[PDB]
Amino acid sequence: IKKYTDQRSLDRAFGLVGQSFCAALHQELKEYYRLLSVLHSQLQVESSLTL
Amino acid sequence: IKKYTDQRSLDRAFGLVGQSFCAALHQELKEYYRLLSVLHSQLQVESSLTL
Amino acid sequence: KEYMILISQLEHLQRQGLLSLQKLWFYIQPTLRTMEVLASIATSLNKGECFGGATLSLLHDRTFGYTGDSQAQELCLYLTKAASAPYFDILERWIYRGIINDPYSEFMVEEHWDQRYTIVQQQIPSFLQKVADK
Amino acid sequence: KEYMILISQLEHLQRQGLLSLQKLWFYIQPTLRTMEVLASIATSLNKGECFGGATLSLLHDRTFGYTGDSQAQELCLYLTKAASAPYFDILERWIYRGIINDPYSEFMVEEHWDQRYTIVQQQIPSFLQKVADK
Amino acid sequence: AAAAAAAAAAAAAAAAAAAAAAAAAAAAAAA
DSSP states (O other): OTTTTTTTTTTOOSSSSSHHHHHHHHOOOOHHHHHHHHHHHHHHOOOOOOO | HHHHHTTTOOOSSOOOOHHHHHHHHHHHHHHHHHHHHHHHHHSOOOOOOOO | HHHHHHHHTTTTTTTTOOOOOTHHHHHHHHHHHHHHHHHHHHHHHHOOOOOHHHHHHHHHHHHSSSSSSHHHHHHHHHHHHHHHHHHHHHHHHHHHHOOOSSSSOOSSSSOOOOOOOOOOOOOOOOSOHHHHOO | OOOHHHHHHHHHHHSSSSOOTTTHHHHHHHHHHHHHHHHHHHHHHHHHTTTTHHHHHHHHHHHHHHOOOHHHHHHHHHHHHHHHHHHHHHHHHHTTTOOOOOSSSOSEEOOOOOOOOEEOOSSOOSSOHHHHHH | HHHHHHHHHHHHHHHHHHHHHHHHHHHHHOO
């Protein structure tokens, strides 16, 4: 997903539609990142850190 | 009771009541096992262990 | 999700590890029950190879047989209700306009002057053919 | 059961070197008084082949004559109330409803204007004779 | 959602530890 946003970069070449679907595909990426923060705030040990 | 559950396995064959009787026989089998778990909590360290 | 969440909760008691081969054995006999019914539905689906309303009538037959155990009845009800809410939505989407869409011919009725909607004998609803003719 | 929890009570004493025969025989003295009244209950139940109201009669006169020992009276009062409260409940539904069903000829009244029922002479009731006639 | 289901299994484990602790009191007050 991260490489697809790198080959995305156009002025707006061969479509407005194809670079909205990518913008949706980056809007999909913000939901994978919010998971990575709640599990790192779950890491608080001072919950058990098992796999 | 274990062999009665082994003979219980039917689609629902020659009687709707027959595995309903073994369903309760699995409920009163179930009550015997909670009495086994309160025995194992006696066994380790966390009363005396006489017969 | 409900099966995997009990296993992680007793692992909090595994860092205080004193749990038994018997305390674990009690929790697995309810969850062999949940899995054995699910396996025996799955084993019937490998031998069956049904889809559409033919699956709906097989799951309607499992609401008859799995009675006597309350909690085996509750999932076999819920599996039938989760198979019928797609199917009767394909019914209703054929009633308001007549939109017949077939990804893999979920509904029975296929599009034909002809008047040839001809239900199918391949599939049948949760009820008998009288409601399929209706 | 209450005997065998007193059994587990005394090995709790025994889990060091403490025990003489008479520290322990203050448990044997209530239990010796227990078995001696309980077996002499149990002897009158057995060899006479007693069934019917005569068992209820027998346990009633043991409660009357045992004014002497309070512990000996307390057991057979519990024995005459645990054996008669089923039997009192059987007559209670019999006088309330009006239909009888003895599973093993339990009651003194058996089958036989032109329909007859008669007090048997095998069972002699713990009640008064007029109130058994009533 | 996923945290709510983790609390439902935690309540089932709480009644489990309470049922085992009640029988442990019968193993420590009549023993």
